[PDB]
């Protein structure tokens, strides 16, 4: 019975790592997109300043 739970615990660990690792990739990609939006606000703010 313990050996059976070891596979389940070990399986959920690897399966959770795949989702956790994949959840980190989408998070890092989202951060880069957020960084691009940060520069956009500076462009809009800078562009709006020129209009003023």
């Amino acid at each position: 019975q313990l050996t059976a739970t070891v596979k389940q615990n070990a399986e959920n660990a690897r399966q959770a790592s795949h989702l956790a690792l994949s959840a980190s990739e989408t998070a890092q990609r989202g951060g880069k997109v957020v960084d691009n939006v940060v520069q956009t606000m500076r462009d809009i703010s800078t562009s709006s300043q020129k209009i003023a």
Binding site: A13, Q15, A20, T26, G30
Partner: peptide, 15 residues
């Protein structure tokens, strides 16, 4: 993130 990390929390209970 809300869909992937949420499943990890559900699978976390199995661990």
């Amino acid at each position: 993130i809300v869909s992937a990390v949420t499943r990890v929390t559900d699978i976390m209970g199995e661990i």
